[PDB]
Design an enzyme around this catalytic site. Sequence first.
Site, PDB file in Angstrom:
ATOM      1  N   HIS A 201      35.235  40.884  40.336  1.00  0.00           N
ATOM      2  CA  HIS A 201      34.527  41.922  41.071  1.00  0.00           C
ATOM      3  C   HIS A 201      33.046  41.543  41.466  1.00  0.00           C
ATOM      4  CE1 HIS A 201      38.247  43.832  41.223  1.00  0.00           C
ATOM      5  NE2 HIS A 201      37.852  44.612  40.431  1.00  0.00           N
ATOM      6  N   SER A 205      36.928  38.429  46.615  1.00  0.00           N
ATOM      7  CA  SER A 205      38.378  37.504  46.662  1.00  0.00           C
ATOM      8  C   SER A 205      37.953  36.298  47.469  1.00  0.00           C
ATOM      9  CB  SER A 205      39.345  38.411  47.467  1.00  0.00           C
ATOM     10  OG  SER A 205      39.712  39.417  46.568  1.00  0.00           O
ATOM     11  N   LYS A 227      50.285  47.388  50.683  1.00  0.00           N
ATOM     12  CA  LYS A 227      50.581  45.786  50.750  1.00  0.00           C
ATOM     13  C   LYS A 227      51.164  45.330  49.245  1.00  0.00           C
ATOM     14  CE  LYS A 227      49.174  41.339  52.405  1.00  0.00           C
ATOM     15  NZ  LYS A 227      49.623  41.088  53.676  1.00  0.00           N
ATOM     16  N   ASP A 228      50.549  45.999  48.180  1.00  0.00           N
ATOM     17  CA  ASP A 228      50.975  45.593  46.783  1.00  0.00           C
ATOM     18  C   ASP A 228      52.160  46.359  46.379  1.00  0.00           C
ATOM     19  OD1 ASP A 228      48.753  43.953  46.977  1.00  0.00           O
ATOM     20  OD2 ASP A 228      47.368  45.373  45.133  1.00  0.00           O
ATOM     21  N   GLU A 271      62.804  27.253  26.784  1.00  0.00           N
ATOM     22  CA  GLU A 271      63.104  27.865  27.952  1.00  0.00           C
ATOM     23  C   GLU A 271      62.541  27.477  29.225  1.00  0.00           C
ATOM     24  OE1 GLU A 271      65.008  30.506  28.896  1.00  0.00           O
ATOM     25  OE2 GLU A 271      64.240  32.605  27.888  1.00  0.00           O
TER      26      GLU A 271
END
Lengths: 379, 439, 111, 49, 446, 64
Positions: A201, A205, A227-228, A271
């Site tokens: 922050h 971004s 959007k999320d 895995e």
Amino acid sequence: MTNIRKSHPLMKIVNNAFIDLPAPSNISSWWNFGSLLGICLILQILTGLFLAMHYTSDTTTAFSSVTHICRDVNYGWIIRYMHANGASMFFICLYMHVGRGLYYGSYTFLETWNIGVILLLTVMATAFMGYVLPWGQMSFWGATVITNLLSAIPYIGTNLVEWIWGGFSVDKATLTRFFAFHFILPFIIMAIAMVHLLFLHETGSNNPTGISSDVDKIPFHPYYTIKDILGALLLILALMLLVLFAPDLLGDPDNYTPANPLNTPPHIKPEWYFLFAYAILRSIPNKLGGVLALAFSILILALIPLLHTSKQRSMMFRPLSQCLFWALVADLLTLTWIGGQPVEHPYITIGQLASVLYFLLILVLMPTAGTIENKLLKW
Amino acid sequence: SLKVAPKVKATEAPAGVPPHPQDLEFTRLPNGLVIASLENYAPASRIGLFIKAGSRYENSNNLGTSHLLRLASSLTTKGASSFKITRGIEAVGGKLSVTSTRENMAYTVECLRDDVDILMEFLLNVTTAPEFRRWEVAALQPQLRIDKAVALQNPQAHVIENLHAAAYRNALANSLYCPDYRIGKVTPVELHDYVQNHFTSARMALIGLGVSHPVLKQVAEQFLNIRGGLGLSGAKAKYHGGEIREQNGDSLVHAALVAESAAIGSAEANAFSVLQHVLGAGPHVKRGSNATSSLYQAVAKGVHEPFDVSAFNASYSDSGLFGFYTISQAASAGDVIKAAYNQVKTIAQGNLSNPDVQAAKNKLKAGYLMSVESSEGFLDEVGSQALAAGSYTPPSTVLQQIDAVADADVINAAKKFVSGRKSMAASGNLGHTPFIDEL
Amino acid sequence: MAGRPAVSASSRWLEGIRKWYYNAAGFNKLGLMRDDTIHENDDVKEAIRRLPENLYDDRVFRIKRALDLSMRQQILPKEQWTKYEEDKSYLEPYLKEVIRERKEREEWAKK
Amino acid sequence: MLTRFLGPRYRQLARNWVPTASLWGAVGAVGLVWATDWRLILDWVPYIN
Amino acid sequence: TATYAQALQSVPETQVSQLDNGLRVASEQSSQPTCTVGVWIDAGSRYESEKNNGAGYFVEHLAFKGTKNRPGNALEKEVESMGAHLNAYSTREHTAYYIKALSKDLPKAVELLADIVQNCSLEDSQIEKERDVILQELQENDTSMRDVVFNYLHATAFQGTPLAQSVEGPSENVRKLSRADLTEYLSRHYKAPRMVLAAAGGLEHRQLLDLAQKHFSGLSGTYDEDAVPTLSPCRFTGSQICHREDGLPLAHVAIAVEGPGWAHPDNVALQVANAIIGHYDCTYGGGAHLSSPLASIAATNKLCQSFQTFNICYADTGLLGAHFVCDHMSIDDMMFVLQGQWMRLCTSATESEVLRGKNLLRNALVSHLDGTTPVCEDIGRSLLTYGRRIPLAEWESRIAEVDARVVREVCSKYFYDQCPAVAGFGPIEQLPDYNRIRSGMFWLRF
Amino acid sequence: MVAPTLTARLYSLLFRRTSTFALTIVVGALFFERAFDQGADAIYEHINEGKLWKHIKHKYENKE
Ligand code: HEM
Ligand code: HEM
């Protein structure tokens, strides 16, 4: 909007990072994985806690309790499989979170990126001990080979392996310790994830263009929450598709037989999200070299920010580096394919070549790719 | 000391204090530059570049350019950057300062004689070839407000700036500080025009102390061939005479009542200078009662409260200002100005004694000798002399000129002030401060 | 990357590959000059601060519209692309001075 | 280490902070040895033998 | 071709001669037509108990107000018509009365100076008149942040010692001071053995000695009291005084530690250390490019509007530290970066910056000694503190022997881990606690 | 260092520099922890003479 809102010295201002936080407009779909990862994290805790209300760590009643969860507990069968297939979604989302940083040069956020590697190590550790919890001939033996790799260390290798094992081999002592450790580690991840955002922050971004997006920031709340939410549904749709239509598609069938230290499974393998790491370790006959290469490949992420050469930052305008990036992704898929196959003559050659290319690309070819384009742009 | 055992090193024939003190070499280049170097063999070397680019040469459009140009030192040049200048000068301990009056603007560097060549190169690059990058000049704008605010903390600075504003309309009325509206409105093109017009040889003069003449001569043969321009508010000065009154609620009231004196070089200027010490222009005894000060003694009777009166003598190349400066409480501001003014009138009426003139001549001679006594004072005196005039007058010759001032000339100088057109600048609580007409 | 214009070409001349790479990079399709996509470190950021107002304001809009193009995942029409020959370095003169200033500052703390 | 570049100013900086870095590694050595009673190391001290 | 080393030797050597009663007559010959002659005496606040504190300031005020030979303003009238400037200053350890005039006017200047010293009048009306001047001046100095803070620093650094007294003295002492105390103070501290008559200019040393022999021979240097009594050591006390007053806009803070003293050779190394830190007062043209690490950053981040490095030297003690003037929200933001700068010289000081400090110290000595007024002060003060007068060339020899190792050792001996004395004034709410200040005196352990 | 009191030599020699301040802590912990155990155990076994297994072992392990 109702008042002057008065007040303010509370925890609401901490939530301004979720509502009024500036964000680039051109943030693509490769970014919901940040919020998807948080969705995955709290999903494992939610299902894991209800799983821990019927799971007992004693070897005499570990596997039988997993069967009791599915067979007896009302709606207990689904919870086990969104937990088992959620970790598949966790590592699916985890690897795209790393991949986007590689492509868009997000590792220039040195504080956030370094905390990201720590987050990656914690989850891979957490998912390893969870696989040992069912105690099903893949839990016992999958943990046997991996933990025994620590015996290659000198002067501490034998000492710490028994210290990790709580005895001379994987047994009830190890199983109880893993369940307790598997309970606490996810809550550590929540704290680090909050720290992970705290280092981001400060700088915001990273638009896919790679240039500063301070001229075109938009509020987060009306544009990216919706959007999320759409991205979350695509995660729920993908996760639920496995759970409700192919619950054992990714898990190995041999895990459904109770662990037997006297009996060895036909093929021993971890895995699918650790298979690429298995291929690198198996590519070297040496034991000390294999464990180092296993750790170096995971820990090479911290070395990536020191290898930047291009005057640009995102791979959007770097066609030479784009070809190398998808070569690395394809090679990482070759490593996954090699890991699930037995060590025979067609795969020793392929496994060694893929592993030697994995390190060669990032260490040599990618930094040389950035230098070459710098000459092509007169700078 | 103790660099090799004996190292009589420099026990030479002249060495300053020993019999030969060495003279001051004076040379004028065909270009028009003036070079003056005195070799005193002192450890400290002082080189000064005196330029006729005072604050008066600004017109109405480019006011405050001299203030920014004075601040413009230690900025990037063609040969040296701002970083190199600040770091290079301070590493050798040298000091770089820019004096600036209404007429001249001296560029001075002080350092040890061992590294005088380095300081000379920095001085030439700063003075002659500045880059004046837009970003650097822009960042220096807030320094104008900081410099002016601190320099105006002293209330006497404001009155002197207003005194020239009230008295003159032309060049000499320009303040020495950038106007309140011009802070941030100065542009690099204006600075280049100011330098290209006023920093041009024939208005320069190179003065150095403790440096050989060929070193000064060789370094000075790279100069220009231009003269000054024109100006709406600055060019040729002409005395007007006015009155500016400023109120700021201060406890103490500063007043400056002056008339038009004569310019330097003129024999009438010497008459005012000796008249200046007749009226008293500064204490000689710490915490004294100023018995010999005619102005202070005149106001002493009647006014039994704190106050201070001196004689103001501002003289320039083409004109001058002579008068008295007063400081008094607002309750009795008028009495102090009027009492001090009446004393000057008595002088104009011939009520002067020869011993009073003799003491003033003694004060003038002593006051001048100590001015050039210091290393920095001597450089400033000769530096301005090489600009206003074209030759150096030794202090002994100056003492004869002061001694050649007749007592009648002092009376005539007083008459010029009394009968002249006054120019009053006041500050503080002006409730009782008189105007010009009720002198 | 794709077939080079000549026939296939391994490495021919130098300007041909640079011209071919410029169209391959694709930042001209967004209406951005070369120096509008540079990485903003503590050096470039200062060299931006020295840009003239007309040039700096032009850069802001070129970036502003490019993010609009990237937001919609679109490109400018064929006639509005930044021509390779018409591309000029408006930031190289300012970068070089900050390069010169930083090298002098660093070497002054070394000597 | 403890420097930024390779210059006489930094070389003097490195040398000036060597004795402190010299004895700082003792804490890393002795303290680690003290923590886990490093025998090979605890076998040489006379009083702790 | 006259190098800086060669030019230092060409400086004329000071000539010092002693009279019969112990008066030290000193001079430096020169070529200037002007000259100054003054008398430096061992007197000040440190020599006065609490009962007669501030007598020197009271005595100095009446020194020029009248003498036995020239009652009233006749003494002043002689100087002004002569053309000379008369000045006098008094500190915690010294007092002076120097008169600058033409070299041809030396004989009259010396005659006046003897009258001021031996024949003070101290008329009863003058004490009452000068009493109101001190009281008015005491209210005057309350507005000077620099002087108030340094008196605050002196009050606590040397608390409970004569060095803690101010030169002017308390207002209550000023009101209650009488003529008897003043004449007793003069008859006790104004004696030939503790005196020095210095001069510099266009005067021959023979003339000055003969003039002193003619006028100062009447001075007495007998046993009077304790046979010129000596001093007593004063103990430094790590402490902190904080006059918090929010009305005043800026905060003046001075932090200092105990110094070496007048005669300690470590002053040269310490003076190099102060030059490295330097000074800055918001009107410097250098700005962010200043070589001093502290001066440059204060200009960049805009921490303070003034800061200076000082080394006050006394008989056996001293104050060594710094004093800064900053906003009320920058006291912490620079005090701890000031201390961090001190720890850099103590721990790791590069050779280059010591060379910068050495050059700065070299210019400080040469440029300070301009004219003749500072020369006599340097000549007079040195003969009261250093004994002999240190030549400039000798000063260079000690300066040239300072390197990084000396600075690191000398600074760590007086700065590292020592308890400092802190004086504050103004809005000093942000000023850190003493333990926070004390813990700034060492590294890696705070 | 040059003072006739122990602590002055104890400070300047060791505690003056924080690097050596930690050395005395770590080395002091070595010698303290070894002596404290023997000091605090010998007193404990004095309170329990003829009580623990150490004090009644001698009548077992045949020839040992
Ligand atoms: C990032 C967080 C977590 C990850 C990645 C993770 C991963 C896994 C994985 C891969 C398994 C193997 C299941 C299988 O193969 O059948 C597992 C099992 C298990 N986990 Fe976790 N887990 C997480 C958090 C938790 C938490 C917070 C709890 C309890 C509060 C928990 C409790 C369990 C239990 C009881 C099992 C055994 C039951 C079963 O396998 O169905 N897990 N976990
Ligand atoms: C449970 C694990 C993790 C969680 C919950 C998490 C969470 C987040 C979130 C929510 C963001 C901001 C969303 C966005 O900008 O797209 C972010 C940013 C970032 N994370 Fe993580 N992360 C995790 C693991 C990782 C990993 C494995 C890496 C590997 C490099 C990493 C490196 C980064 C980087 C470089 C960014 C910068 C984003 C940007 O460029 O704007 N994180 N993280």
